């Protein structure tokens, strides 16, 4: 799922 956005580390 996470690969569908762009952002910072969790």
């Amino acid at each position: 799922g996470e690969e569908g956005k762009r952002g910072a580390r969790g």
Partner: antibody
Framework: QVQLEESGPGLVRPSETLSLSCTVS?????????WGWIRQSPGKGLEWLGS???????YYRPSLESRLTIAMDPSKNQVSLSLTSVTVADSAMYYC?????????????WGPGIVVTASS | QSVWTQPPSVSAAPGQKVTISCSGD????????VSWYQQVPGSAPKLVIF???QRPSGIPARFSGSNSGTTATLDIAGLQRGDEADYYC???????????FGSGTKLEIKR
């Protein structure tokens, strides 16, 4: 393995729209990768413009978000850039990239690049 | 910051090792995976390090990376003449919600 090439005009007039295209070969655009655009002005650094993924989620450089549209067409295996109201400052080498998103944000591969001059 | 800070230049002889730093405000880089790009003049940038320390297939192990959180570092050991290039770090900046590149470092190979 992923093949990318940019196409479009080398010269655009100020205030007109810069339209570039990138053909993606040898890799599915329906996989979990973003497709995007970076530019580099002569003698200067790399500037991220934005990216898109097949679901439609899109990211833009905040300072250009009003002028910039980045889209993709999985049927044609294309990712497009459209930058409106161009000025001299948009003169640059424009690169197509594949981006691994999430928290990774790595760019591989890069197209060979296309030189665009904005001038009258 | 909207550009990561890198030294303008590093210089060394073949076989030797250089390190190139990439810095953001405070510990912002702790929240990001850093990647590094090699740009030989006249060519597109090429990914050499990703997720702080990983190497793409075919990149030799003499390229290595780390991310301290305040600064990220690209090591290039066993320098070869073909290594002359500009090197850029890059990383997502969550405070700006944008992908940011470093200002770039030119590697000169001594002779």
């Amino acid at each position: 393995q992923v093949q990318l090439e940019e196409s479009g005009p080398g010269l655009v007039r100020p205030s007109e729209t810069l339209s570039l295209s990138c053909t993606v070969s040898g890799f599915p655009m329906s996989e979990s990768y973003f497709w995007g655009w970076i530019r580099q002005s002569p003698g200067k650094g790399l500037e991220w413009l934005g990216s898109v993924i097949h679901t439609g989620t899109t990211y833009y450089r905040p300072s250009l978000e009003s002028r910039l549209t980045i889209a993709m067409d999985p049927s044609k295996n294309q990712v497009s850039l459209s930058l409106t109201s161009v000025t001299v400052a948009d003169s640059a080498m424009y690169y197509c990239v594949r981006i691994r998103g999430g928290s990774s944000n790595w760019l591989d591969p890069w197209g060979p690049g296309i030189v665009v001059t904005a001038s009258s | 910051q909207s550009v990561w800070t890198q030294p303008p230049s590093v210089s060394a002889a073949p076989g030797q090792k250089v390190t190139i730093s990439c810095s953001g405000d405070d510990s912002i880089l702790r929240s990001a995976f850093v990647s590094w790009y090699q740009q030989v003049p006249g060519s597109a940038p090429k990914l050499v390090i990703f997720d702080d320390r990983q190497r793409p297939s075919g990149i030799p192990a003499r390229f290595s990376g780390s991310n301290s959180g305040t600064t990220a570092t690209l090591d290039i050991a066993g320098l070869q003449r073909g290594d002359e290039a500009d090197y850029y770090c890059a990383a997502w900046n969550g405070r700006l919600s944008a992908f940011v590149f470093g200002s770039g470092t030119k590697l000169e190979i001594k002779r």
